[PDB]
Structure formats: structure tokens, C-alpha cells
Amino acid sequence: LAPGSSRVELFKRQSSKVPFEKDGKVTERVVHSFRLPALVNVDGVMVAIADARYETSFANSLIDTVAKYSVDDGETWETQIAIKNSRASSVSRVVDPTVIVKGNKLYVLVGSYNSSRSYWTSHGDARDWDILLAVGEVTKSTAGGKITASIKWGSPVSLKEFFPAEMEGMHTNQFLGGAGVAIVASNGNLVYPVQVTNKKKQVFSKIFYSEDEGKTWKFGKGRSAFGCSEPVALEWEGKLIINTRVDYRRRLVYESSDMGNTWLEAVGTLSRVWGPSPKSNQPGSQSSFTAVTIEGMRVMLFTHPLNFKGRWLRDRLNLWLTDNQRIYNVGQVSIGDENSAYSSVLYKDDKLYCLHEINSNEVYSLVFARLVGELRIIKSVLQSWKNWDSHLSSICTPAGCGPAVTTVGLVGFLSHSATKTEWEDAYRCVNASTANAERVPNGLKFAGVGGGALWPVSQQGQNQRYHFANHAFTLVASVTIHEVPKGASPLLGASLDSSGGKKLLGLSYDKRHQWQPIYGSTPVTPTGSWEMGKRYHVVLTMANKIGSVYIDGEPLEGSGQTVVPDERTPDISHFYVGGYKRSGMPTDSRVTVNNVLLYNRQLNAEEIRTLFLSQDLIGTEAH
Numbered sequence: 001l002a003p004g005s006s007r008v009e010l011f012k013r014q015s016s017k018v019p020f021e022k023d024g025k026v027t028e029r030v031v032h033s034f035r036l037p038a039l040v041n042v043d044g045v046m047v048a049i050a051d052a053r054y055e056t057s058f059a060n061s062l063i064d065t066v067a068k069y070s071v072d073d074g075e076t077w078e079t080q081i082a083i084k085n086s087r088a089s090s091v092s093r094v095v096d097p098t099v100i101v102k103g104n105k106l107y108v109l110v111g112s113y114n115s116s117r118s119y120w121t122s123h124g125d126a127r128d129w130d131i132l133l134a135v136g137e138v139t140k141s142t143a144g145g146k147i148t149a150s151i152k153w154g155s156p157v158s159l160k161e162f163f164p165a166e167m168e169g170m171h172t173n174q175f176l177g178g179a180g181v182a183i184v185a186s187n188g189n190l191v192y193p194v195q196v197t198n199k200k201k202q203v204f205s206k207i208f209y210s211e212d213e214g215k216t217w218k219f220g221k222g223r224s225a226f227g228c229s230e231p232v233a234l235e236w237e238g239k240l241i242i243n244t245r246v247d248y249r250r251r252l253v254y255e256s257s258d259m260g261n262t263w264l265e266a267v268g269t270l271s272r273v274w275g276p277s278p279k280s281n282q283p284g285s286q287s288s289f290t291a292v293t294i295e296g297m298r299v300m301l302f303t304h305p306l307n308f309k310g311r312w313l314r315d316r317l318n319l320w321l322t323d324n325q326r327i328y329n330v331g332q333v334s335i336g337d338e339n340s341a342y343s344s345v346l347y348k349d350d351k352l353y354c355l356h357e358i359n360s361n362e363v364y365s366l367v368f369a370r371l372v373g374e375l376r377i378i379k380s381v382l383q384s385w386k387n388w389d390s391h392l393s394s395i396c397t398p399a400g401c402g403p404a405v406t407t408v409g410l411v412g413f414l415s416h417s418a419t420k421t422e423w424e425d426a427y428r429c430v431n432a433s434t435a436n437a438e439r440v441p442n443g444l445k446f447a448g449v450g451g452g453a454l455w456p457v458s459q460q461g462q463n464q465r466y467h468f469a470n471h472a473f474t475l476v477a478s479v480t481i482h483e484v485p486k487g488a489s490p491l492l493g494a495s496l497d498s499s500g501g502k503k504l505l506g507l508s509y510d511k512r513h514q515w516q517p518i519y520g521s522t523p524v525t526p527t528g529s530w531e532m533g534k535r536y537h538v539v540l541t542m543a544n545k546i547g548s549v550y551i552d553g554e555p556l557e558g559s560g561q562t563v564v565p566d567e568r569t570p571d572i573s574h575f576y577v578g579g580y581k582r583s584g585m586p587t588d589s590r591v592t593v594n595n596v597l598l599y600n601r602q603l604n605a606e607e608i609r610t611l612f613l614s615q616d617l618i619g620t621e622a623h
């Protein structure tokens with residue numbers, strides 16, 4: 001939890017009471033565990049919805065949906081049960097409440113089970129299941145000089161009539177909301193990303209939406225891959241972005257521009273960025289994923305635990321900030337090594353809050369955190385992004401002013417700032433590690449065996465912000481070679497392995513003063529010529545499985561070659577710059593590199609021309 005931030009235990013395990021209703025009688029009843037946080041703003045009234053697991057934290061046990069609400073930004077709260085279960089058996093339950101705010105209404109979607117003690121995805125049929133929508137109406141009043149609110153919860157209505165018996169190549173079984181907070185789309189539609197099972201017990205995600213304020217519901221025709229559960233969605237630039245849980249695998253993210261009729265994996269931006277554990281081989285989690293506007297910039301906030309402990313412990317809740325280009329780790333929201341899986345982030349009246357789980361010995365509370373420190377960090381980072389984009393965009397490039405330097409898709413930039421061991425990203429997301437480097441204007445001068453910089457891709461580890469490069473990228477740099485090498489030496493490239501010896505696309509230079517562009521594992525043909533001490537502009541592009549190399553804005557002869565053989569997606573380890581940065585590779589590149597730009601797409605001709613012409617105007621040195 002950041003400096004300046006604080007929290008309280010809001011839903012207190014084995015302590016907080018809720019009004020338990022049974023057979024016409026209501027009693028204040030202590031709850032064992034509270035899980036499944038959803039924290040929202042209903043026109044000024046903060047509402048926290050969760051599971052109240054009365055007797056045990058076990059999923060298949062007695063559970064009602066509880067709500068706490070506050071008209072004073074969380075200093076005090078009132079408590080009620082928003083939805084009660086059927087009371088059919090000792091384990092009846094309403095589960096995984098998923099919330100949408102619209103007007104003064106809360107729409108809460110829950111699965112309902114009567115008596116099964118088995119996890120829902122293990123059921124062979126729907127005998128124990130129903131899917132219910134309950135609507136809470138929030139009313140505001142000003143009694144006794146001060147503001148008051150109340151919420152009237154309607155009786156739940158079953159939406160089972162909207163679930164078809166068949167979907168493309170399958171027979172349907174059950175479905176649930178994705179948990180947490182869902183959305184109202186820019187067209188007014190209520191939009192629940194849902195997790196669905198078929199009769200083969202496979203799980204997949206769909207879009208379940210209503211065009212009439214929840215009276216009737218439809219499914220989008222498309223779906224995620226099998227294995228994608230607890231989907232969470234937001235709307236971004238006219239499309240739904242659906243971020244999914246995949247147990248034992250990296251999270252998949254899809255985009256849909258047609259209410260779920262067609263799903264496209266977001267390979268160029270967010271898909272496969274987030275891993276559920278250090279080795280991405282453990283259960284995943286529910287995630288808060290929202291689009292907000294902070295100081296005028298639309299961005300997305302995303303949370304997920306790091307899960308160093310493994311299994312479902314899910315320690316180390318982390319918050320991430322992205323503008324769909326750069327991906328910044330705000331940091332850890334939970335405290336120390338506590339188990340802290342599910343979460344919900346709310347941005348309200350320029351203050352940031354998080355309602356999230358803490359779990360000790362399988363007893364769960366929900367803490368309510370005031371994210372003061374994190375918002376300060378976010379605002380600082382957003383200012384940097386805005387300032388560097390403005391700087392670049394405002395440059396008058398050589399003709400009159402020619403076309404502007406492009407910042408669309410610009411993800412990282414290594415320039416003047418560097419410490420003894422790192423080359424700093426101007427965008428503050430991913431630095432490069434360095435060896436044998438001396439600082440020069442807008443870059444670094446390298447020498448010696450082991451020299452160079454490494455800008456990690458898969459080497460980022462659990463969370464791989466540059467995963468997009470496996471699909472498309474442009475890497476740009478200005479370079480100068482200081483010594484003629486003994487053989488062939490590296491200058492810039494994308495490596496598939498940790499050593500640099502297995503390349504996707506790279507540029508080397510040799511003892512005969514020629515360039516050696518390297519296309520995958522293809523035989524290298526030296527070409528062109530360079531002069532010692534002369535500055536050159538280098539561009540490497542890859543898209544559509546094809547790599548190209550440009551020197552001074554022009555392609556090398558014979559460039560535009562296949563660098564991804566076969567159907568497998570590359571798994572780039574890192575970009576190397578100015579050497580391999582590997583003391584085990586015997587090369588010694590004596591070179592200076594300045595202003596390394598990384599884009600998440602293949603730049604066009606004009607954009608490459610502009611960068612070449614403007615190469616002496618883009619550095620961060622004077623700023």
C-alpha cells in the first residue's frame with residue numbers, strides 16, 4: 001500500500017453482522033467470510049457489494065449477497081442483504097455477484113444454487129442452477145440537516161429463459177456473471193461479460209447484454225477460447241475489451257466492436273501481458289478492469305494478484321495503469337505478503353479507492369483502501385506520458401514543417417536518462433539493463449566483451465508488457481560504429497533466446513565494412529557499406545511475419561524477409577542494443593546508440609522517413 005494511503009477492515013470476518021432473513025424473521029448474524037468485492041458509485045453514493053459466506057469460506061456453502069453503502073465517501077456505512085438465497089438447504093447460495101450501475105439503479109447478476117456441494121464447472125447438468133437478476137434502487141434524501149441514502153432491493157428475477165440450449169458446436173450447461181463490476185455501453189446497453197459452461201464441462205466467456213434496461217437479454221454470437229473464465233470488460237474507443245481469467249495460463253484479452261458477435265484476441269496490446277503467477281502455472285483470479293478519465297486522459301486501471309505463494313493463495317495484489325500502449329505497474333495495493341486475491345477499484349470525485357480481499361487461514365475479510373499514494377503516482381506517470389507525446393508531436397520536422405513525428409503506438413523510448421546500470425524509459429514503464437556503457441547525449445556508448453543494453457521482452461517475467469512485439473513492432477535507433485570489428489558484431493535486434501544467438505530480426509556489422517541484417521535463422525547475406533565514425537539511422541520492422549531493415553530511411557537490398565517460419569507465435573526474449581550484454585558472447589561492439597524508440601506496430605514509409613529526418617530533434621537531453 002503506497003505512502004499516504006490507508007485502509008480499514010470494512011467487511012470484518014467473524015465479526016461483522018448482516019440482517020439474516022429466514023421464515024419471516026430477521027436476525028443480526030455474524031458472517032464467517034466476505035468475498036467477491038464490487039465497489040461502485042451510484043450518483044454520489046458509494047456501494048460495496050460482496051458475498052456474505054455465513055459459515056465457511058468454501059464456495060459451495062450458505063451465501064447471501066450483502067451490500068454496504070455510504071454517503072460520506074466511506075467514513076461510515078449502512079448494511080443490508082441485497083439478495084438472499086433460496087433457503088432450500090444448508091448450502092443454498094447466490095453467487096459471484098456482478099454489478100452494473102445505471103442511473104440510480106444497481107443491477108446485480110448472481111448464480112443461484114440450491115443444494116450442490118460441488119464446484120459449478122464440475123456439474124454435468126443444470127439441475128441445481130438458476131441465474132438471477134436483482135435491481136437495487138438508490139434514493140437520496142437530506143434528513144436532519146445531513147445527507148442520507150437508502151437502497152430498496154427488488155425481488156430477483158430469473159433470466160434462465162434467455163439462455164439457449166445450444167451454442168455453435170455445443171450444448172449449454174450453466175452461466176454466471178464474471179464477478180465484480182460490469183458496464184453500461186456508450187449506446188446504453190447493459191453489458192455483462194459472462195462465463196458459460198457446456199455439457200463437456202468446458203468454460204468460455206461470452207457477452208450477455210440488454211437493450212431494454214434489463215427486461216430482456218441476448219448473447220453475442222462469438223466467444224473466447226475455452227478455458228477463459230471470470231471475464232471482466234470495459235469499453236475503449238468503440239470496442240469492448242474483455243480481459244479473461246485462464247487458470248494455469250497467461251490471461252487472454254479480446255476486443256469486440258459488435259457487442260460480442262466477433263471476438264479478436266488483442267495480441268497487439270494487452271493479451272498475454274498478465275500472468276497469474278511468476279511461472280504462469282497456477283490458478284488465476286478475478287480482476288478489476290475499468291476505463292476512467294484522470295486529468296483529461298482516458299486510461300485503464302487493472303488489478304491482479306502476483307501469487308508468489310501459488311495455488312489459490314494469491315498474495316500481492318498489484319495495480320496497473322495503461323493507455324492501451326504503455327503499461328505501468330503502479331505497485332502493490334495489498335500489504336506485505338498477505339493473501340489478497342479479488343479486488344475492485346473505484347475512481348470517484350478525483351479520489352481512488354480499492355475494496356479487496358485479505359485471507360488468513362481461509363477466513364476472508366474485505367478491506368477498504370484509500371489509494372492516495374497510488375493516485376499521486378498515476379497522475380505523475382500520466383503527466384510524463386502527456387508531456388513526452390506533446391514534445392515529440394510538437395517538433396517542427398524538416399521540410400515549412402513536414403509531417404509530425406508519430407506517437408501513435410510509441411511504447412518506449414531510451415534517450416538521455418541513464419543510471420550506472422540502466423537506460424531509462426522516458427515512458428517510465430520498462431528500463432533496459434546495461435553493461436560497459438558510458439553516458440553520451442541522448443544515449444550510451446558501449447565497449448568490450450559483455451557490453452550492451454538489454455530491453456527485456458519475455459525477460460520481463462510474469463508480466464510481459466512488450467508481448468505485442470511477437471506480432472508486430474518497429475525498433476528505431478541512431479547508431480555510430482567506432483571500431484572495425486574482428487568478425488561480425490551485433491548492433492540492434494530482437495532475440496528469441498536469452499543469449500542473443502537465436503535472433504528473430506537483427507542488424508550486425510562486419511570487418512569488411514558491410515551490414516549484416518539477420519532474418520530469423522536464415523543464412524545471412526552481408527550488404528551495403530558503412531564508414532567508421534559516421535552516424536546512421538536504423539529501423540527494424542516486423543509485421544505479418546516479415547522483417548525489414550532500413551538504414552538512413554532506406555531498406556537494405558534484399559530486406560522484407562520471412563522471420564517467423566511456421567504457425568507458432570514467436571516468443572521474443574529481449575531487444576539487444578549496442579552489444580549482446582552477455583559476457584559469454586565473445587563479441588566486442590564499440591558503438592554509440594542514441595534515441596531508441598519502440599512502437600507496437602509496423603511504421604509506414606512516411607513515418608520512417610520523418611523519424612530519419614528528425615533524428616536530431618527528438619532527444620530528451622534538454623528537457
Ligand SMILES: CC(=O)N[C@H]1[C@H]([C@H](O)[C@H](O)CO)O[C@@](Oc2ccc3c(C)cc(=O)oc3c2)(C(=O)O)C[C@@H]1O
Pocket residue numbers: 059095096111119120121176229230284285312313341
Ligand atoms: C461459483 C464459484 O465456484 N465461484 C468461485 C470461483 C470458481 O470456482 C472458479 O472460477 C472455478 O470455476 O473461484 C473462487 O473460489 C475458489 C475455487 C476453488 C478453490 C480451491 C480448489 C482451493 C482454494 O483454496 O480456494 C478456491 C476458491 C476463487 O477464489 O478462485 C471464487 C468463487 O468462490
